[PDB]
Coordinates of C-alpha atoms in Angstrom, one line a residue:
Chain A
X178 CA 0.0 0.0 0.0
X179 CA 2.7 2.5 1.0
X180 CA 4.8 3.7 -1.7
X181 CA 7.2 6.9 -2.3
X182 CA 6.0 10.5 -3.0
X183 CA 7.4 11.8 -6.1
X184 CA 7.5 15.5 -7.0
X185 CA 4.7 16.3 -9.3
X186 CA 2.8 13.8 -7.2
X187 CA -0.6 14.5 -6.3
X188 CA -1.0 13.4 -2.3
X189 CA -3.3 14.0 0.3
X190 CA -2.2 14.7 4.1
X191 CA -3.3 13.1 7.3
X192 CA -2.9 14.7 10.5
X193 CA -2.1 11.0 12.9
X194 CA -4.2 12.2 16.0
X195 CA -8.0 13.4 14.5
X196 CA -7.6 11.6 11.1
X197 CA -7.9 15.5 9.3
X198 CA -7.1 16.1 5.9
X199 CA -5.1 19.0 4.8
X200 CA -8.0 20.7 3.1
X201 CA -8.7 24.1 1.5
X202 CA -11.9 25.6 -0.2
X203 CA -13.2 28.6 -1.8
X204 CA -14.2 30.5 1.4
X205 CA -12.0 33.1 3.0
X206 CA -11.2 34.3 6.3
X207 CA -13.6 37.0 7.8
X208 CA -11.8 40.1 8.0
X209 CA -12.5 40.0 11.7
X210 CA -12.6 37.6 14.3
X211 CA -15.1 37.7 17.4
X212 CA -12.6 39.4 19.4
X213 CA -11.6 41.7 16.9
X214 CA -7.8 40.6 15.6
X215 CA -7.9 40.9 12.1
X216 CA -7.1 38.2 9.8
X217 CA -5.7 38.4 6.2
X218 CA -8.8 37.5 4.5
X219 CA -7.0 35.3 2.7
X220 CA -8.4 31.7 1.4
X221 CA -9.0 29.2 4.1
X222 CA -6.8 26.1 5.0
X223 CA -9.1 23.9 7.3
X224 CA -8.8 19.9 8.8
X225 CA -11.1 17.9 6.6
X226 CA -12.9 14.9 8.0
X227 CA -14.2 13.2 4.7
X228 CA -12.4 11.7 1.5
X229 CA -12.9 14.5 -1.5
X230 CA -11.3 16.7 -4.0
X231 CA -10.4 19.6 -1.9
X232 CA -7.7 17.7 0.2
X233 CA -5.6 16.8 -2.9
X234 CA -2.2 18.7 -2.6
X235 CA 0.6 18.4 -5.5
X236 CA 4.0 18.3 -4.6
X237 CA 6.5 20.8 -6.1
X238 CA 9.9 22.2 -6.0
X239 CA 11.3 25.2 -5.2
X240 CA 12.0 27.6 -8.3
X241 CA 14.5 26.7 -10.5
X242 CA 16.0 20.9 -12.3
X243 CA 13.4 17.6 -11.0
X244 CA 11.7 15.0 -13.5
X245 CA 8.6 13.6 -12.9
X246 CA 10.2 10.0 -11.2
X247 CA 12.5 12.1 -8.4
X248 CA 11.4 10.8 -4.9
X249 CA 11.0 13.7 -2.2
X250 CA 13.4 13.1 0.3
X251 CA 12.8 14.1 4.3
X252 CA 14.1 18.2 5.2
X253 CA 13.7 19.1 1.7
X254 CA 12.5 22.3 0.4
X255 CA 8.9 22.0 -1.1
X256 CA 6.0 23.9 -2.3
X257 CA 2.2 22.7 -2.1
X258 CA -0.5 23.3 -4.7
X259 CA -4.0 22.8 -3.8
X260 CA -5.2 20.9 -6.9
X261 CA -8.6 22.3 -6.4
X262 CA -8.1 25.8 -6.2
X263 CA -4.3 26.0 -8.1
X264 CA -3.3 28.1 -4.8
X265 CA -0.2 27.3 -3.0
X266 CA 0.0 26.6 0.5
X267 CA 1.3 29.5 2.0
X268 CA 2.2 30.7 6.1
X269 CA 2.9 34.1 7.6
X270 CA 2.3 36.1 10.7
X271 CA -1.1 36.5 11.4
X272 CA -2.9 35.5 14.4
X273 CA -4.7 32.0 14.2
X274 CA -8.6 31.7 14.0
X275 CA -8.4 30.1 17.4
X276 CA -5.1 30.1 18.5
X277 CA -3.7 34.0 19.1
X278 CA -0.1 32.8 19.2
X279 CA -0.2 30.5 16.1
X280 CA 0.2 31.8 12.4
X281 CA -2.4 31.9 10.0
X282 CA -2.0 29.2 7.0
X283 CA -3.4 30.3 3.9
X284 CA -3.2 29.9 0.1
X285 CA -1.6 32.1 -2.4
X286 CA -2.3 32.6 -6.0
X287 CA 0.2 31.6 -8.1
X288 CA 0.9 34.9 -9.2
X289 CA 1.8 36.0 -5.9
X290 CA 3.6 32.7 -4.8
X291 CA 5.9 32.8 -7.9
X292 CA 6.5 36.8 -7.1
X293 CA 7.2 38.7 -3.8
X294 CA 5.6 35.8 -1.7
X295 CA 7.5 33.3 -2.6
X296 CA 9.5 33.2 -0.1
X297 CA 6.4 32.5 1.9
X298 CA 5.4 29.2 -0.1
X299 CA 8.3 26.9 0.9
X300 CA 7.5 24.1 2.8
X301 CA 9.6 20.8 4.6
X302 CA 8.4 17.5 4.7
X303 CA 10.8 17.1 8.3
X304 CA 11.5 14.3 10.0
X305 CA 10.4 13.7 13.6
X306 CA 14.3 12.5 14.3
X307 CA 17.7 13.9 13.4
X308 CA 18.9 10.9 11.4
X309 CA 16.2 10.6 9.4
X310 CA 17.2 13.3 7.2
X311 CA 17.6 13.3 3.5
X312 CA 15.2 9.7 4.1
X313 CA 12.7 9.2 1.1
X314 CA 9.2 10.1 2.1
X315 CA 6.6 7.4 1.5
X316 CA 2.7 7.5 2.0
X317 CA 1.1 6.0 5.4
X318 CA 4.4 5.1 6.7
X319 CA 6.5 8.2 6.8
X320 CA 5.9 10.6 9.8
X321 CA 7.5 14.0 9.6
X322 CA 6.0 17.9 10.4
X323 CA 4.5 19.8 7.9
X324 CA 6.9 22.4 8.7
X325 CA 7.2 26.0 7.1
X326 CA 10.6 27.2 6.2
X327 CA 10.4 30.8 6.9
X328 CA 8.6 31.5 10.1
X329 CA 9.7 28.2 11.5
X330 CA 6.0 26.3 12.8
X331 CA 4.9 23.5 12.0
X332 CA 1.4 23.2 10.9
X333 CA -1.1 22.1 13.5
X334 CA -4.5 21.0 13.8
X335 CA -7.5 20.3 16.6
X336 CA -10.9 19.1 16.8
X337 CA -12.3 19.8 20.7
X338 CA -13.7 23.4 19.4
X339 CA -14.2 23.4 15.5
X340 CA -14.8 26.5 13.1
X341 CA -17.6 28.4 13.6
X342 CA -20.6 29.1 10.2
X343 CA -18.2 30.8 8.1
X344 CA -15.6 27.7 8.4
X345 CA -18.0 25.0 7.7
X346 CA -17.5 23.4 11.1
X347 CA -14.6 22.1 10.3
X348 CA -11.1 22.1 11.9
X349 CA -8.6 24.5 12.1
X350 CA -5.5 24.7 11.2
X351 CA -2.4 27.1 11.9
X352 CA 0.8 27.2 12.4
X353 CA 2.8 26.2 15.6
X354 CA 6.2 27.3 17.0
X355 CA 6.2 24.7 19.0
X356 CA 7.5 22.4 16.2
X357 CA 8.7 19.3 18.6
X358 CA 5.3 18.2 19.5
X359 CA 3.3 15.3 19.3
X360 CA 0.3 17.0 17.8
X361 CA 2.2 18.2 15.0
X362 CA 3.2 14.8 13.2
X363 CA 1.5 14.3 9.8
X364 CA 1.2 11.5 7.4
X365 CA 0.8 11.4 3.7
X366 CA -2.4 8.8 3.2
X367 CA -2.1 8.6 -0.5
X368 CA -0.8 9.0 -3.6
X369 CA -3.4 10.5 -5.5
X370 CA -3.1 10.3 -9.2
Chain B
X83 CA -7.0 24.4 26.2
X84 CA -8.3 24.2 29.8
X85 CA -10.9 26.3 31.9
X86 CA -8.2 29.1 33.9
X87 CA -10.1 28.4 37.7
X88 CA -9.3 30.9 40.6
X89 CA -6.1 29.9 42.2
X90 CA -4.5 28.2 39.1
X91 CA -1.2 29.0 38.6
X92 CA -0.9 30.2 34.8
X93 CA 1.9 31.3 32.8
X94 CA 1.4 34.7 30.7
X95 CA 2.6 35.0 26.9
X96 CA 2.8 38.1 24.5
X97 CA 0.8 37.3 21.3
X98 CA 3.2 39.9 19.1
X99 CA 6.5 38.7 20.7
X100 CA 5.8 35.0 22.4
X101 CA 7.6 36.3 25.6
X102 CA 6.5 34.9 28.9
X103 CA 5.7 37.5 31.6
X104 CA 8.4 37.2 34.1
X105 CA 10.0 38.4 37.0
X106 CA 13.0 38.0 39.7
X107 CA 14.5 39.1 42.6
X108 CA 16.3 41.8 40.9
X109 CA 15.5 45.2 41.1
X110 CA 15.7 48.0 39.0
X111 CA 18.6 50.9 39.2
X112 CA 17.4 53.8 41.2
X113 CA 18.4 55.7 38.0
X114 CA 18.7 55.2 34.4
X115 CA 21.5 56.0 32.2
X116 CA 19.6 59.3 31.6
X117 CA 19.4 60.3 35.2
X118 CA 15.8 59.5 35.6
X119 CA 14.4 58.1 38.9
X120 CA 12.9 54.4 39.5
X121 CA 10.8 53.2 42.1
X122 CA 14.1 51.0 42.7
X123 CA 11.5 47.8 42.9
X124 CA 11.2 44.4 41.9
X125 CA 11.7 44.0 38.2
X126 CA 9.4 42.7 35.4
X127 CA 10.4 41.4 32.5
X128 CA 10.1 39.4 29.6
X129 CA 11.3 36.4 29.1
X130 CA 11.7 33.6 26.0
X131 CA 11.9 30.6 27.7
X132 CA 10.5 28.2 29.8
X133 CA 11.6 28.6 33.7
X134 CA 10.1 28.6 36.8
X135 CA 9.9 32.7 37.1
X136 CA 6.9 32.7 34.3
X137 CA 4.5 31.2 36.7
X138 CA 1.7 33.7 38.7
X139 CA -0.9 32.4 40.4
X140 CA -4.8 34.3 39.8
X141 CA -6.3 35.6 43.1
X142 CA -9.3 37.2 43.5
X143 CA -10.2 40.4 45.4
X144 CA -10.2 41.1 48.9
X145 CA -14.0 41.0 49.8
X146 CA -14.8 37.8 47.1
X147 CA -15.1 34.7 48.5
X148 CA -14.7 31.9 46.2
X149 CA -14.1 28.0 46.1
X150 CA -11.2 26.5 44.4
X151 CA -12.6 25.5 40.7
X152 CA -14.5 29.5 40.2
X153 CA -13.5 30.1 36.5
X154 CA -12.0 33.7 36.2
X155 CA -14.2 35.7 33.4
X156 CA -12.9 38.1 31.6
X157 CA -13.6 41.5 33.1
X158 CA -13.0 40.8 36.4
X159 CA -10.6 42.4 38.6
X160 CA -7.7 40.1 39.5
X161 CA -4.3 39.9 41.3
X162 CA -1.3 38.1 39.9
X163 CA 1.0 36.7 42.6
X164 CA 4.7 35.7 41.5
X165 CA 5.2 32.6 43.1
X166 CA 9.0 32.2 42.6
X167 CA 8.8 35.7 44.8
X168 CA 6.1 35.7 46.5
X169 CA 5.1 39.5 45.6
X170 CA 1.8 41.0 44.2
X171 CA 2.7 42.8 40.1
X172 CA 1.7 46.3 40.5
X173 CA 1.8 49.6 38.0
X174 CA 2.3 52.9 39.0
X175 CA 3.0 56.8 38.1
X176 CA 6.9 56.0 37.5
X177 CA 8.1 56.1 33.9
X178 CA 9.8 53.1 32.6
X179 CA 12.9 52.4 31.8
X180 CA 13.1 52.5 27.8
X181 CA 9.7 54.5 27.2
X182 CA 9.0 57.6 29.5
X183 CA 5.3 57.8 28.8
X184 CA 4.8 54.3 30.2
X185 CA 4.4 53.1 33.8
X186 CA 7.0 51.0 35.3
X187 CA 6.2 47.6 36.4
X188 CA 7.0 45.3 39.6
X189 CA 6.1 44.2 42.2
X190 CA 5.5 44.2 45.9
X191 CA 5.8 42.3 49.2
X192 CA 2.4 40.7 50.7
X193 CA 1.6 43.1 53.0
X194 CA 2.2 45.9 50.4
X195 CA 0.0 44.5 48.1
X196 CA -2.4 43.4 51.7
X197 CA -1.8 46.7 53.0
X198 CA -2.2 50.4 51.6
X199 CA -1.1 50.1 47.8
X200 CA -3.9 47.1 47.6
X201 CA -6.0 49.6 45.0
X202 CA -2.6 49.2 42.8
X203 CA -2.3 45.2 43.0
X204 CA -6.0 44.7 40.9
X205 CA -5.5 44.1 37.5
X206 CA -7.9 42.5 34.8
X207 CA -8.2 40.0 31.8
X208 CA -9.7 42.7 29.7
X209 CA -11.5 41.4 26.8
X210 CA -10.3 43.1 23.5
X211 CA -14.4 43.5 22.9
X212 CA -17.0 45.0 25.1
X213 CA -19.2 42.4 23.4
X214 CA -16.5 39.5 25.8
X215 CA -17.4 40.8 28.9
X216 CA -17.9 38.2 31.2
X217 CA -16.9 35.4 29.4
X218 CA -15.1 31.8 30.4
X219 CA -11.4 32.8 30.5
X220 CA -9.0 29.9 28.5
X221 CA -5.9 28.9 28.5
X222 CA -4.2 29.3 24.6
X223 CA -7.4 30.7 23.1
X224 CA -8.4 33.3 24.8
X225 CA -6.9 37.1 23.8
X226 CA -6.7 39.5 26.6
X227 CA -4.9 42.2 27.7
X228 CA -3.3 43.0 31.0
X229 CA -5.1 45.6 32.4
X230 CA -4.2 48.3 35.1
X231 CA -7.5 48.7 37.0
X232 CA -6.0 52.0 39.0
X233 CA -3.9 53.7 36.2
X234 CA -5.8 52.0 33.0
X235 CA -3.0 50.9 31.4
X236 CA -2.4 47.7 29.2
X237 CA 1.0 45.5 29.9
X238 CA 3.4 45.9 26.7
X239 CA 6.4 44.6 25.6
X240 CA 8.6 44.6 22.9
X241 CA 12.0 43.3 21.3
X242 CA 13.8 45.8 19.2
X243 CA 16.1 46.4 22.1
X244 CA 16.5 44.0 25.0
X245 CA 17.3 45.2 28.6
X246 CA 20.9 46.1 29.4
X247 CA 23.2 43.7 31.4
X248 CA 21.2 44.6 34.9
X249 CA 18.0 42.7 33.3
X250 CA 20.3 39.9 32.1
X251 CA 18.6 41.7 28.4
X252 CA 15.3 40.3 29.0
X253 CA 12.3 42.2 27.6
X254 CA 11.2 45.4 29.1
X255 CA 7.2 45.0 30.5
X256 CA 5.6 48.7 30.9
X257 CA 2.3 49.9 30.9
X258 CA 0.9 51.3 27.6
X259 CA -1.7 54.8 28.5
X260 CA -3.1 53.8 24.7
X261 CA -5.2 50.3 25.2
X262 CA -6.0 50.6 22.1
X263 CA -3.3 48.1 20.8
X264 CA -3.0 44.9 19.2
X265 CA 0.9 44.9 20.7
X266 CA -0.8 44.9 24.3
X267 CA -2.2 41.5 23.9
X268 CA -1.3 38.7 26.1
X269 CA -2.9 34.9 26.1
X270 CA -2.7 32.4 29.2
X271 CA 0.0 30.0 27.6
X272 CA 0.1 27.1 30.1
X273 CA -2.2 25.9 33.1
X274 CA 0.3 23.9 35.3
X275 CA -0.2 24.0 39.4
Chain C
X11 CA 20.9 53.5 2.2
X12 CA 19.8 51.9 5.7
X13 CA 21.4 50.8 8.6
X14 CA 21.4 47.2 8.7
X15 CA 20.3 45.4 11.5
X16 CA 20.7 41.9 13.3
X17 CA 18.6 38.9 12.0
X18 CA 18.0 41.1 9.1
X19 CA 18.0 39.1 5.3
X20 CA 20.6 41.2 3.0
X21 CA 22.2 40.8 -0.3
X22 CA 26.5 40.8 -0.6
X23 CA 27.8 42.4 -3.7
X24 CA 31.3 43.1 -4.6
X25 CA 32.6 46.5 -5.5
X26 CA 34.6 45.2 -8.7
X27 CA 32.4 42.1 -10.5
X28 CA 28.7 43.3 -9.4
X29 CA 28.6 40.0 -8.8
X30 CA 26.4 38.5 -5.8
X31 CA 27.5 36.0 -2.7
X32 CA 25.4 33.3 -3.6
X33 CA 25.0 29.9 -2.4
X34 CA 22.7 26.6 -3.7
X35 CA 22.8 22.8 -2.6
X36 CA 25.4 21.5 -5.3
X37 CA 28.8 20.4 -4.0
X38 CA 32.3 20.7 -4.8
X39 CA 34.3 17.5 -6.9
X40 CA 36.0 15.7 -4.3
X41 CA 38.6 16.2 -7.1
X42 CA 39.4 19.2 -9.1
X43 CA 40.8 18.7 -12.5
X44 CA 44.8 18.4 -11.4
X45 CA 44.1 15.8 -8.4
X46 CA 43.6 18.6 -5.9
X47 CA 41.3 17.3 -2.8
X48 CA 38.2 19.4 -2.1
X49 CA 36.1 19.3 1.2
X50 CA 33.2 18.3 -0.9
X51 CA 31.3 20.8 0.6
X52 CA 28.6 23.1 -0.1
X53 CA 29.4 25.5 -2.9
X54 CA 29.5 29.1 -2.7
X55 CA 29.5 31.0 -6.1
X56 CA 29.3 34.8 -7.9
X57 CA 26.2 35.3 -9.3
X58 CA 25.8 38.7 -11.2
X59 CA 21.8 38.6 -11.3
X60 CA 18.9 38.4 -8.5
X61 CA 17.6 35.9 -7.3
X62 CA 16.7 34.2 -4.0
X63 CA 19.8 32.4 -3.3
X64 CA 21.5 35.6 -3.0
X65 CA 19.9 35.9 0.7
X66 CA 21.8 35.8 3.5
X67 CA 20.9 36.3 7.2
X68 CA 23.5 38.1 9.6
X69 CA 23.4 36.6 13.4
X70 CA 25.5 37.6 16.4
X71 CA 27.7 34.9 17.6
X72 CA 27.1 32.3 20.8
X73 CA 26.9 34.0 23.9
X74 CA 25.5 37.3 22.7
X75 CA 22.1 38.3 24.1
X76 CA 22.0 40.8 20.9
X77 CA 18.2 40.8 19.8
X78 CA 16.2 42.2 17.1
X79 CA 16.3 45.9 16.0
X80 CA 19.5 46.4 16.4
X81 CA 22.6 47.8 14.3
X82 CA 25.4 46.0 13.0
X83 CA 28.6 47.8 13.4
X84 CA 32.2 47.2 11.3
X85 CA 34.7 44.5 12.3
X86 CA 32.0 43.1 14.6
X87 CA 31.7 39.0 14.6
X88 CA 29.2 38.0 12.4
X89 CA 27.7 34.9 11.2
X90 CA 25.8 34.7 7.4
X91 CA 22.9 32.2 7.4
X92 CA 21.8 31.0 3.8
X93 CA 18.2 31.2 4.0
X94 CA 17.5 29.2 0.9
X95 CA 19.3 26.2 2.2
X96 CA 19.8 27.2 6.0
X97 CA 23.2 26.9 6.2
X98 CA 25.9 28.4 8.1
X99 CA 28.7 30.0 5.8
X100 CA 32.2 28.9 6.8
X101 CA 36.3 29.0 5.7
X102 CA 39.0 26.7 5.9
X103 CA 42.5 25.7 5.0
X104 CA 41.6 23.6 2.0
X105 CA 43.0 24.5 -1.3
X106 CA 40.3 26.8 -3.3
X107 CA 38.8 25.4 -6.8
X108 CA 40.8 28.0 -8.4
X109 CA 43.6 29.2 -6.7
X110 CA 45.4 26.9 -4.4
X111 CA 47.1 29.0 -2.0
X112 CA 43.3 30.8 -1.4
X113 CA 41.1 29.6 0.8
X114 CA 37.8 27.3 0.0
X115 CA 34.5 28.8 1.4
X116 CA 31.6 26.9 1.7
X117 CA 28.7 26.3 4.0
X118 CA 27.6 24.2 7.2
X119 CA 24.9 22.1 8.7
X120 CA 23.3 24.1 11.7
X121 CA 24.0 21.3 13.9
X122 CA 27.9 21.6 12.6
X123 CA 28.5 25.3 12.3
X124 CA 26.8 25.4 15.8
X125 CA 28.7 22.9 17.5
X126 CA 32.5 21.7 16.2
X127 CA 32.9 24.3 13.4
X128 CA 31.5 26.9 15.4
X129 CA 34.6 29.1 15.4
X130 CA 35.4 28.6 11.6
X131 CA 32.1 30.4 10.9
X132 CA 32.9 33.6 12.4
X133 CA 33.1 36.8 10.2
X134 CA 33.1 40.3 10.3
X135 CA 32.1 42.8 8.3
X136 CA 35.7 44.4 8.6
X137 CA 36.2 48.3 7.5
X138 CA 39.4 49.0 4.5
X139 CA 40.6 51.4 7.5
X140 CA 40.6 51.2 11.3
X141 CA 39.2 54.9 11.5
X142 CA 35.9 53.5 11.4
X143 CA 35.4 50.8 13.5
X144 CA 32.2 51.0 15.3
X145 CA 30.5 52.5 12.6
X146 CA 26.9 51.6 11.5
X147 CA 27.1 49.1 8.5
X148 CA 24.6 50.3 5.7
X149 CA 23.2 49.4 2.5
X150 CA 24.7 50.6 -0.7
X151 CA 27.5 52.9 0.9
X152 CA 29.3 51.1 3.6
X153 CA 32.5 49.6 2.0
X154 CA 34.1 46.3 3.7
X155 CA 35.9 43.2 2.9
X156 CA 34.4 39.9 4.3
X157 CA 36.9 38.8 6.8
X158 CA 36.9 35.4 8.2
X159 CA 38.6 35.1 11.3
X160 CA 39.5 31.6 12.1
X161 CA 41.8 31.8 8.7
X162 CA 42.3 35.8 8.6
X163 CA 41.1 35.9 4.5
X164 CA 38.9 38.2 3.3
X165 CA 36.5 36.5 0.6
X166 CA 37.4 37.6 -3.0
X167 CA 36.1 36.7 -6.4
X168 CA 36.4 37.7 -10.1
X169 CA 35.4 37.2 -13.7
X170 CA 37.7 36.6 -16.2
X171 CA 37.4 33.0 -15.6
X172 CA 34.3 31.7 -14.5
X173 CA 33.6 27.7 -13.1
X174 CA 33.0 25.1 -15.0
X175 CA 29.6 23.2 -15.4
X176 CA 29.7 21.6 -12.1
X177 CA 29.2 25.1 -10.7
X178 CA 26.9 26.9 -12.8
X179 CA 29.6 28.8 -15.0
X180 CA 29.1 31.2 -11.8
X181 CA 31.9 33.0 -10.3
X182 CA 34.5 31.5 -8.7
X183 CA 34.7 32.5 -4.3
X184 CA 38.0 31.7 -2.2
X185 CA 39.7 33.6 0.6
X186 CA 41.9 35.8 -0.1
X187 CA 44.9 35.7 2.2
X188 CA 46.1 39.3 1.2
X189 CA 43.2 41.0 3.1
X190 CA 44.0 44.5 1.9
X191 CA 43.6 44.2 -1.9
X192 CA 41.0 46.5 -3.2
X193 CA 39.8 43.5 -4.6
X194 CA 38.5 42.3 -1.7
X195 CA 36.1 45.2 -0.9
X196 CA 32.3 44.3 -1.0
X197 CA 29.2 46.6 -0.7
X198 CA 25.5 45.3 1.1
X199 CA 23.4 46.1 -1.6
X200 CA 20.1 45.5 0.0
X201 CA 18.1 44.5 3.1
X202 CA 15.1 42.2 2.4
X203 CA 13.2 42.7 5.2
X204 CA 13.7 46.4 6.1

């Protein structure tokens, strides 16, 4: 069942405690919270609990020489494309929905995440150890931190409160800088096309 | 994310900066490098890492009498007690020591804070809404600032520039006159006694 | 012109190639073409255009409490992170792709250039005259040679012959052991986060 990720490959992400797919969707943030902290408005990145189309990410490199056979190897520089909305996966620092001292996650268009952004859009399949470095990352097996390069969190996800009407109920995700964590550790459930 | 009780010992984290509010048995210098005059008390600081010195316990006011699992709700007046020290956080009408139009912050002994400057040991979860005002305070999720109930100030912090080598360059805590602030807000980080 | 600051992300251009310190995951032959041993280490090239792998990020060394908003100064220790690959830069006494009495610069694991190699990946930003140490180091007009300490060579490349295709046909770096030459003085051409 397991087998390697690739780069071009189309995957989807499983978050090992709640089961949670790495899912995105049309909707946007509200430009403000209850409390009042403004968000980016930017495109929301939620935990989905269901199989569907929104929670299919392709794998890609950074800017600039990969075929389409080239496994992805652990602590390597990545990007992430939601297939459904051709947005890539993108932290910063913005306050959380829920969680004041975790960063918003988001999605880019690709203008942006090819320009001044881009920067922003680089991601690291890391592994939970030190020697696992440069290790080939495999779906179902393989546990590492979704972890984002420049602001240094790892993405993180919950489900005893979930998103209120505008989120769809479902869960939230942001970015954590506490990156060695047990909540933190993802899995990659399948290899998608 | 827990309930924060009456009694709990919490630890206090900037949302802007991810400093813990802290304090020691150091004191600050009777004068500045600019000649200006200190209360010469207890200081409080900032401080990025995990230690003891982070942890205050919540106490409620004098004439409230209340059992030992009373959620604090945001809004009420409150007392933080240093419990590496033993001391009552207070504000007062002494500039700080980086920003001259913010109070200094410290602390005092138990019957200080029990005694005549009691007025100056209240402080409050204030709710960055009017709309929050009596809600459930919790820990991680919850966005508050340290309030001043006596001068009506907000706790503050920043890192551009770190204390000099008699705050071991620690984080300067003062009290901001304008509330009105996204850098005065504070979250409970960890629930722990 | 701004005064550059501590943790800041800044480009390194020198005053006689316009070329750009710029780094990139390829490594150096274990052998050169004449049987010379390399490190096999991390290469660091010249690269006259912009790009991302032009970013470097200055850090105080161990010890120092130094913080955020905060000035750099001339002949102060320094260390340059590469942000692309997060890597520590770093010079040694091996024999320079190039020029074999200069000295090969490359780059460092974190867990490396923070623990073993920690003093090998000490610079400083030092000024072409001692009149002005202490000053503020700023974008565009404060000249300076990149001075490694360790090795005491100031980083120095050129372009009438440029690396072959294991490097990019990018310009050659090495250390220069004659820190003075006025070819060794570089100019921080931008902050990226200012």
């Amino acid at each position: 069942d397991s087998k390697t990720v690739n780069y071009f490959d189309i995957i989807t992400i499983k978050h090992q405690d709640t089961d949670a797919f790495l899912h995105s969707h049309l909707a946007r943030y509200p430009q403000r919270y209850e409390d009042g902290r403004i968000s980016s408005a930017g495109q929301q990145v939620t935990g989905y609990t269901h199989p569907d189309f929104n929670n299919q990410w392709e794998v890609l490199p950074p800017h600039g020489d990969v075929g389409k056979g080239q496994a992805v190897l652990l602590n390597q520089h990545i990007r992430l494309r939601h297939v459904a909305t051709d947005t890539y996966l993108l932290a910063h620092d913005v306050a959380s929905p829920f969680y004041p001292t975790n960063e918003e996650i988001t999605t880019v268009t690709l203008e942006e995440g090819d320009g001044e952004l881009y920067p922003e859009t680089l991601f690291a399949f890391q592994p939970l150890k030190k020697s696992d470095e440069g290790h080939v990352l495999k779906s179902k097996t393989v546990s590492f931190r979704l972890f984002h390069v420049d602001t240094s969190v790892a993405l993180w996800t919950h489900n005893d409160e979930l998103l209120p009407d505008w989120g769809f109920q479902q869960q939230e995700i942001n970015g954590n800088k506490k990156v060695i964590d047990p909540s933190n550790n993802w899995v990659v459930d399948e290899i998608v096309n």
